[PDB]
Design a protein around this ligand. Structure first.
Ligand SMILES: [Mg+2]
Ligand SMILES: [Mg+2]
Ligand SMILES: [Mg+2]
Ligand SMILES: [Mg+2]
Ligand SMILES: [Mg+2]
Ligand SMILES: [Mg+2]
Ligand SMILES: [Mg+2]
Length: 45
RNA sequence: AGUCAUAGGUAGCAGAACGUUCUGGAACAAUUACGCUGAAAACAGUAACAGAAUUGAAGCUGCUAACAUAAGUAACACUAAAUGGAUAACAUGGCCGUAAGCCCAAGGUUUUGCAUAACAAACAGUGAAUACGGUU
């Protein structure tokens, strides 16, 4: 559900102009973001 | 056309001229000029006669613009410290660590991402779905 080289900071991400997401934008800056996946109840980091 | 007389000058006064732009007299540079000199000067070598002037500039610590001088001079000394053939990913060393870390506010308003030069800004990027802040 996460791309951990991007999370630790050692890979480029989807939307690479962000570089420091808030609580939301973690879901959409993930390189492994699947649109067909359901959306979680709280949308955490 | 031969004799005589006069000719230092500030302030000031008087007389004679040169030059710039424009106009009148129908039109004086379509096809340029260029023998390099002439004149006492202002100057002349693309009319002349009159007229109208925002009419003459080394000289106002004048204004504007350009270009020099000082001069390749001063400066590139607040800080932690760098090394390996790279402002390196790797390795070694060091500095902060109530900050030189992290999260926001005010303010800024695209300053944010992409190419081992390149033709790349012309292209991208900010998602309210936890009773996030506002609007009340
Ligand atoms: Mg005299
Ligand atoms: Mg005398
Ligand atoms: Mg005439
Ligand atoms: Mg005048
Ligand atoms: Mg030098
Ligand atoms: Mg180095
Ligand atoms: Mg702001």
């Amino acid at each position: 559900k996460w791309d951990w080289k991007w999370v630790l900071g050692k890979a480029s991400g989807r939307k690479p102009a962000i570089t420091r997401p808030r609580r939301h934008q973690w879901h959409y800056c993930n390189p492994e973001y699947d649109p067909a996946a359901p959306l979680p109840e709280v949308l955490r980091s």
